[PDB]
Amino acid sequence: SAYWQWFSKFLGRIL
Numbered sequence: 001s002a003y004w005q006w007f008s009k010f011l012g013r014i015l
Contacts, residue, residue, distance in 0.1 A: 002015045 002012060004011045005014060
């Protein structure tokens with residue numbers, strides 16, 4: 001349950 005945002009930590013592992 002994450003929110004991809006195209007980035008390092010802000011994608012997949014984000015949240």
